[PDB]
Each structure stands twice: as C-alpha cells, then as structure tokens.
Write a protein that binds this ligand. Structure first.
Ligand SMILES: Cc1cc2c(cc1C)[n+](C(=O)C(C)C)c1c(=O)[nH]c(=O)nc-1n2C[C@H](O)[C@H](O)[C@H](O)COP(=O)([O-])OP(=O)(O)OC[C@H]1O[C@@H](n2cnc3c(N)ncnc32)[C@H](O)[C@@H]1O
Ligand SMILES: Cc1cc2c(cc1C)[n+](C(=O)C(C)C)c1c(=O)[nH]c(=O)nc-1n2C[C@H](O)[C@H](O)[C@H](O)COP(=O)([O-])OP(=O)(O)OC[C@H]1O[C@@H](n2cnc3c(N)ncnc32)[C@H](O)[C@@H]1O
Lengths: 339, 339
C-alpha cells in the first residue's frame, strides 16, 4: 500500500515511524515515502526550545492531555538507555515563575516532582511572586529529527525533496493514503483559517553553567511572550516571543533585544554568555489540533487523508500521542480496505 | 598587626578574606599575608567535586551544622547577582541514591526542595531502591579560588609561594598571629594523628547533556566509594573513591576504571562522553574539624595561632562558617591585645 507522509518535522517523522513500526509486517508490502520541501535543520521543529511542557491551560479536546501524557511516558521510558541523548533526550529540572498565584497545571502529575516553590527559592528571582518547580525532559528538535530519520531510513522508509502542490497531486500520483503533517503551511494544501503562525524568535547562547530551565509568565502579555531560558544538550536557548499571525521569517533586532534584555535581567550572569545563534519559527497555532481522517474523491478513485497538524507550541511535548492515534486511524483505513 | 595565613585552599582564602573584611578598618594597620607552597590550580580545593552537600550522618560537633547552614546561606545569597558564576557558583538539582531506605539527612532543610524520590523516578536508576532529591549549589574550587584571590588581592593582601617549615620560623618572621589552614599537610607543622588523607581520584569528562547530579551510596563500602556524577560549570566530574590513609598522589588506572565503569553503568550516556582529565586529591579527613586558638611561646614572645583544618569531604560545603568563627576568635585575640 502506498502511503505518503507530507512533512518531515517532528510530526511527520514520528508519525511515519509509528505507522511503519506498527504495520509494517501486519500488512506485507507497505510502501512508505516522505515528501517534504524542508528537512532538518530547516523545520519548525528544528527551532523549538526543546522542552516537554504543555501549556498551562487545560486543552479543549481533552484527549490532548492524554497524548501529552502518553508522549511523556514514552519519552521517560527511554531515560535509562545509553542512547537517550543520542535521541536528543535528557532530564532537566526547572522553574515556572509568575507574578500572582495560579492554579496548578493539569500536567502537574505527568511531570516528575512537581511542587510549588518556597520563598527562599523565589528569592532567587525577585521579580516573580509565585511559581512551580518540577523536573522534566529536554527533547531536542534537530537531534530527534536526525534520530527519527536514521531510524526510518534503516526501516526502509524513503525521503523526497518535494513541494506538494496539492493532495490531488499526490493522489494522481499513486498514494492510497496521505498523511498531512505540513505544520503551519498546511493551509496551503487546503484552507484552514483556524491555523495561524505563532511566531517566535530565540537566541542560542553558550552558558554551560545554567543547568535548569526557567520560564516566566505574564498573564497579560500572553504565553511565551515572557523571557524564558532553556538549557539544551549543548547550548542554552534564550526566548521570549509568540506573535500570532506574524509571518516574517527573519530574526528582528527588536525582538532580539527584548529577549536578550529580559533574560539577562532574569538571569544576570547571562552577562557573560556568548551568543552563538538566533532563529525564528512559526508555531502552528490552532484552537485545537487537527488530527482526523478525510476521504478525497479524484476521478473514479477515492484517496485517504489523515491530518495531523496545529500543535502550536507543544508539538514536541505531544508528538508521540498523536503519532499513535494516526496509526490507529490508519489501521481502520486498512480494515476498510480489508487489509 | 601582622597576620599570616598559611595555606591558600578554599579555607585559607575565605578565612583571610573574612578576617580582613571584618577587621580591616576596625583596626588600622592590619597586615595580612598568605604563605602557601601550593596555589590554584594546585590545592586540594582545586580537585573537589564542587558540590554543596555535607555528609549524611549527624555531626560530631554540633557546630558543624551551623557552619554548613551559614555557608549555604551565604552562598545562596549570591545566587541572583550577575557574578555568581564568576564566583564559580550555580544552582544544580539532583539525586542521592541508596540501596535500602535511610533516614533523612540533617541538612534536609538547608537545601532547597528536599524530598524522597518516587518510584518512577527511581525507575530511572534501576539498581537502587531508595533515595532523595533536592536542589543545591555548585561552587567550583578553582574558580572560587581565583575569585577569592582577586578579591583579597584588591583588598591588598599579599601572596607568597613559600613552604613554611615551622610555626617557629613564621613567628620568628614577626608574625603576630598565624592562621593555620594547611589542610592534610597540617600534621607536619604539628602532629595530629586525627588527621588523615581521604584520597579521592576523579575524572572530568565532557558531557553537557547531564544537568543533574547523581550520588549513589553503598552503606558498606563507605562514603564516596560509590559512583557519583557531578555537573560543573563546564565539565562533569565522574567520581567514586575515598581511601583513608592513602597518600599516593598519582591517578591510578584501577581507580580510573572503577570510576569509569561505575558511572558508565549508573549513567550509560557517558558511553559517548569524552574524557578530558583525571585527578586525585587528599581529603583532610578528621573526626571533627580543628578550629581553635592556640598560643605559642618562643623566647620571650608569645604568638597566637588559630587552627582551621580537617574539613574532610565538605571543605567547600562549610568553608564560610568556619571562616566566620575564626574571625570571631581572631577578634577575641585583638580584644586581649586591647586592639
Ligand atoms: C518555534 C517554536 C516552537 C516551539 C517552541 C519554541 C519555538 C521557537 N517551544 C516552546 O515554545 C517552549 C518555550 C516551551 C517548544 C518546546 O520547547 N516544546 C514543544 O513541545 N514545542 C515547542 N515548540 C512548538 C513546536 O516547535 C511545534 O509544535 C512543532 O515543531 C511542529 O512540528 P511539525 O512537524 O508539525 O512542523 P514542522 O517542524 O515545520 O514540520 C513541517 C514539515 O512539513 C513540511 N511541509 C509543509 N508543507 C509542505 C508541502 N506543501 N510540501 C512539502 N513539505 C511540506 C515542511 O517542509 C516540514 O517538513
Ligand atoms: C579531593 C576531594 C575533595 C572534595 C570532594 C571531592 C574530592 C576529590 N567533594 C566531594 O567529595 C563530593 C563527592 C561531594 C567535595 C565537594 O564536592 N564539596 C565539598 O564541600 N568538599 C568536597 N571535597 C573536600 C574538599 O575538597 C576539602 O575539604 C577542601 O578542599 C579543603 O580545603 P583546604 O584549604 O583545607 O585544603 P587545600 O585546598 O589543600 O589547602 C591547603 C593549602 O595549605 C597549603 N599548605 C599546607 N601546608 C603548607 C606549608 N607548610 N607551607 C605552605 N603552604 C602549606 C597548601 O599549599 C594549600 O595552599
């Protein structure tokens, strides 16, 4: 069966893998290919802060929290193996600062060791008045992508520089199924005003002494508009913006400073950190994730699509969960074809 | 007044500073000098794992805990300033593993966020069955030493790479008050069978993805004979030995392997960590710290000594506390001299 996964961000890959991993030898032939106009280091995924942490607010389609939970476990499960950092994974602990008290996140129990910070702790940051502490995981985009890639590759999945113009295209081509994991740019293949770019610029900097993440929150300014600092496998990511509907893909000096000054302020020692890079990306913002099946008639032949997009600022945090669901639907699709 | 501090490890320096800091302009002249046959990077201090963490067992002296507490606060107080990492400080969180349950450490409340680990957590390190979690501080030897040094220097203390041979000699120089902070080698200036070398070899390795410390414990094997891993300002320190009465100062291949293999099991990712150095040092082991005053008659002239040594494996963890006490006695000494 000809399957075509469009997009090679964390979503496309995991998904592809997951499907193949689950059905390769459940169905004999099973042909998977991945088309994408961008591959790492060019995906949005490549620019994510790399932390597992869903938004504070309980998800609209409640199953999302499961996907999140499932993603976290899967990840955690790897922590212990030798390859975990080779997958781009590692545990990290850190803070979430606030200016006023606030309700515990629904994921309070998915993460390890969640607890409200004490005053002494808070004294470590004079701006904030309230916050939490917990340990979690770093799952780095680029590395994970490459891992995922090698995995798929050895599994025989094939990749292709392609810019799909239409699903039609792909279908006239031969795809029995098509899995749309085109991120923000999904709208192009089929409009979806729900979907929008959540622009975010960041700065990578070299400062090995920071071992914990620190994420501040301005309830007014909106989420991820406040300074944040996230240690990674080697560099640290300085961050602070999330602009909806903004599509400029260039790093802007203004933002650069607002990030630089804000973090520097939050974390004073940053004064000596050396900047090694700046990047900007589009969070595939959407009220909810679109992950559902859709049949498409072209001539006398039907073609199956399965959407998986709009993971906003938690694409990594919940990638796996969805990847599973798709496989699930994908399966139903096979049942209907009678295998 | 002529003061002479012998030794330039973390102990000598802090102490010197502390004295000067407190009495420089309480007394006018005040002449401080520091003699030491070894200066960083050569002190024992230079090789410490760099973590704030007193031993598990309840203190011999009641005062040790306070010194520890005082040291921790002083340190913590700096976390927030821009220079903290320039002093060689940063917060780090981590684990303490055990094979059987065990009583909470007395310092449970001095550290930030102490708590017993949960099972999921424990699943992360399968050979153990029990343990704790808390956040604390890294205070790196070398860096701190240099910091301390620049500070003293600008304060006008003067340094001399010199091997003192006798208290007698120093006193004979014109030394009004000698401050003894000669670490394990203290015995030489005046015997003390209580004092012994707590040999420890370690391996520095480059592995930036490890962000938390992990210290295992073998109740039989003795303290710090078990593998431990401690992230630092740039490298990670692999460790695992504490041999009493051993004075070989060379790194030994068997230790190197027992450390390497033990940590590597504890933390399989090191499979890819690159070794960048190996070192060995003597913990100035002693049943309890010697920190007390002692007068010494030489000819028709008395000379005041204040001992400060035998901080075993917590010299950093408690340096400041003692430094204060000395200043205190030092003061009494001034009172007696009627200022
Ligand atoms: C930008 C950004 C995102 C962050 C982020 C910080 C930043 C700056 N933070 C944070 O905000 C921290 C502060 C907490 C994280 C984080 O720390 N944790 C977390 O879970 N999430 C975070 N994300 C969100 C995450 O990056 C995003 O959800 C995923 O990358 C989406 O992956 P994808 O595969 O759907 O898109 P993407 O990676 O762009 O994959 C899209 C793919 O489809 C391809 N494509 C599209 N259309 C076509 C076409 N027509 N033909 C061919 N190929 C096509 C494109 O080439 C690419 O292959
Ligand atoms: C070796 C070692 C120690 C560790 C350690 C791991 C290792 C391998 N860990 C751990 O074990 C982790 C696993 C938790 C830490 C840790 O992580 N945290 C912690 O708090 N403690 C730890 N320590 C213990 C600490 O290093 C030690 O207490 C202090 O360095 C003592 O400083 P000092 O100034 O008294 O001696 P040292 O630094 O040797 O200063 C001695 C000074 O006196 C000088 N000197 C002596 N005699 C003379 C003389 N006759 N003439 C001139 N100069 C003289 C010598 O030149 C030097 O200047």
């Amino acid at each position: 069966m000809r399957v075509v996964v469009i997009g090679a961000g964390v979503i496309g890959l995991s998904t592809a893998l997951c499907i193949h991993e689950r059905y390769h030898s459940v169905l004999q032939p099973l042909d998977v290919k991945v088309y994408a106009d961008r591959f790492t280091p060019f995906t949005t995924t490549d620019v994510a802060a790399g932390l597992w942490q869903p938004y504070t607010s309980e998800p609209s389609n409640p199953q999302e929290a499961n996907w999140n939970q499932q993603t976290f476990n899967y990840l955690l499960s790897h922590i212990g193996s030798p390859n975990a950092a080779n997958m781009g994974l590692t545990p990290v602990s850190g803070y979430n600062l606030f200016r006023e008290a606030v309700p515990d996140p629904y994921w309070k129990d998915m993460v390890l060791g969640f607890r409200k910070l004490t005053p002494r702790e808070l004294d470590m940051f004079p701006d904030y008045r309230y916050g939490w502490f917990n340990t979690s995981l770093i799952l780095e985009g680029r590395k994970y992508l490459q891992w995922l890639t090698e995995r798929l590759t050895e599994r025989g999945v094939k990749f292709f520089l392609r810019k799909v113009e239409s699903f039609e295209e792909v279908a006239r081509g031969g795809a029995d199924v098509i899995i749309n994991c085109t991120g923000v740019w999904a709208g192009v293949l089929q409009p979806d005003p729900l979907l929008q770019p959540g622009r975010g610029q960041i700065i990578k900097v070299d400062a090995p002494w920071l071992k914990n993440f620190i994420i501040t929150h301005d309830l007014e300014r909106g989420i991820y508009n406040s300074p944040y600092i996230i240690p990674g496998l080697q560099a640290v990511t300085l961050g602070g913006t999330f602009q909806v509907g903004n599509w400029n893909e260039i790093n802007n000096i203004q933002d650069h400073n607002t990030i630089w000054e804000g973090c520097c302020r939050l974390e004073p020692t940053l004064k000596d950190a050396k900047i090694v890079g700046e990047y900007t990306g589009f969070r595939p913002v959407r009220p909810q994730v679109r992950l559902e099946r859709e049949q498409l008639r072209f001539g006398s032949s039907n073609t199956e699509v399965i959407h998986n997009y709009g993971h906003g600022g938690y694409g990594l945090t919940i990638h796996w969960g969805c990847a599973l669901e798709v496989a699930k639907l994908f399966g139903k699709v096979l049942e209907e074809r009678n295998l």
